[PDB]
Scaffold this active site. Structure first.
Site, PDB file in Angstrom:
ATOM      1  N   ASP A   1     -40.365 -15.382  18.330  1.00 16.06           N
ATOM      2  CA  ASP A   1     -39.370 -14.182  18.044  1.00 16.06           C
ATOM      3  C   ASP A   1     -37.929 -14.236  17.961  1.00 16.06           C
ATOM      4  O   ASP A   1     -37.439 -13.930  18.984  1.00 16.06           O
ATOM      5  CB  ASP A   1     -40.122 -13.005  18.488  1.00 16.06           C
ATOM      6  CG  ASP A   1     -39.669 -11.660  18.043  1.00 16.06           C
ATOM      7  OD1 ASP A   1     -39.004 -11.721  17.073  1.00 16.06           O
ATOM      8  OD2 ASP A   1     -39.874 -10.566  18.741  1.00 16.06           O
TER       9      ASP A   1
ATOM     10  N   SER B   1     -24.614 -11.120   5.127  1.00 16.89           N
ATOM     11  CA  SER B   1     -24.908 -11.919   3.738  1.00 16.89           C
ATOM     12  C   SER B   1     -23.914 -11.547   2.821  1.00 16.89           C
ATOM     13  O   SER B   1     -23.321 -10.144   2.688  1.00 16.89           O
ATOM     14  CB  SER B   1     -26.278 -11.347   3.423  1.00 16.89           C
ATOM     15  OG  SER B   1     -26.602 -12.073   1.958  1.00 16.89           O
TER      16      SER B   1
END
EC number: 3.4.23.22
Length: 330
Positions: A35, A199
């Site tokens: 994770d 992004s």
């Protein structure tokens, strides 16, 4: 040194991925959920309440000649899905695909919430976010990556998740055969303890790319792709019958649909998520509706580039002094 371990989906939908990890001596193998959105290595153990264990393999520190209790330390964690677990802490030798760390904190669960108990395939988690998010108290502990870092050939780990298929987690090296094109790197903010980056935009199917900044985290421990409502609505508007459902908990669409792809920007480079990855799966076997793999992050507080997004790329988590993230197509 390096490590290379195969990661496998826990079910036919890729709800999560499990990677075998050796803990203790003689080795005890547990299947952990790697994770990058958390920083505790916790396992189901001989200390876990019997009623909260259902088929999981447990870590038994009393059978390990290298286990040492980290006396006076405890841990307690809450995840974004409402699940939680807590217990005490040991140190033991932990190996991932041939890579060994001695004195790794292994958080032994005394209590786990229903979600963990009902997931017979997941024996615990191996956190790979920054060690500042570790919950061990008072002595905060380091992640397996942080502890391994100095011994690795290069302070990196890569995630190569498969779509309905096994993939790989590599530590200390980049496998140049695992991706096409080149790996484009982007800056990481460690301020919140996550592999947080920006992004440069997105495209829906064959539409024109929209240049827009989208901050988010690269999270292997989250199943789906959670993005701003504006982006998510522009995607599902291209699917006839797609709509948000309050009983199911997000966007559903007729399983009859063939979905458009979704492209996200990494600097001037592009990562294309095929439509099939976004067709997450039916809300039940035989259902009319299927659950979307792209969902709104509106209720969460952060955008999450989860497995739906990461499985479309070869991802490099560069843990050098100034961390960076790299994405390559595959």
């Amino acid at each position: 040194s390096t490590g290379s371990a195969t990661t496998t989906p826990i079910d036919s939908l890729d709800d999560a991925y499990i990677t075998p990890v050796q803990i203790g001596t003689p080795a005890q193998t547990l299947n952990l959920d790697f994770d990058t959105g958390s920083s505790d290595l916790w396992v189901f153990s001989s200390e876990t309440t019997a009623s909260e264990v259902d088929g999981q393999t447990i870590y038994t520190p009393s059978k390990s000649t290298t286990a040492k209790l980290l006396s006076g330390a405890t841990w307690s964690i809450s995840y974004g899905d409402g699940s939680s677990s807590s217990g005490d802490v040991y140190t033991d030798t932990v190996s991932v695909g041939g890579l060994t760390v001695t004195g790794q904190a292994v958080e032994s669960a005394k209590k786990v919430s229903s979600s963990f108990t009902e997931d017979s395939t997941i024996d615990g988690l191996l956190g790979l976010a920054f060690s500042t998010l570790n919950t061990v108290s008072p002595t905060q502990q380091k992640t397996f990556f942080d502890n391994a870092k100095a011994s690795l050939d290069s302070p990196v780990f890569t995630a190569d998740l498969g779509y309905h298929a096994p993939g790989t987690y590599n530590f200390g090296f980049i496998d140049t055969t695992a991706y096409t094109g080149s790996i484009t790197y982007t800056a990481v903010s460690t301020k919140q303890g996550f592999w947080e980056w920006t992004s440069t935009g997105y495209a829906v199917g064959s539409g024109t790319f929209k240049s827009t900044s989208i901050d988010g985290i690269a999270d292997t421990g989250t199943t789906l792709l959670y993005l701003p409502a504006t982006v998510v609505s522009a995607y599902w508007a291209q699917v006839s019958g797609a709509k948000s459902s309050s009983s199911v908990g997000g966007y559903v669409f007729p399983c009859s649909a063939t979905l458009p792809s979704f492209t996200f920007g990494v600097g001037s480079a592009r990562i294309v998520i095929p439509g099939d990855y976004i067709d997450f799966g039916p809300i039940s076997t035989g259902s009319s509706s299927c659950f979307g793999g792209i969902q709104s992050s509106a209720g969460i507080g952060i955008n999450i580039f989860g497995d739906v997004a990461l499985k479309a790329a070869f991802v490099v988590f560069n843990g050098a002094t100034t961390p960076t993230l790299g994405f390559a197509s595959k």
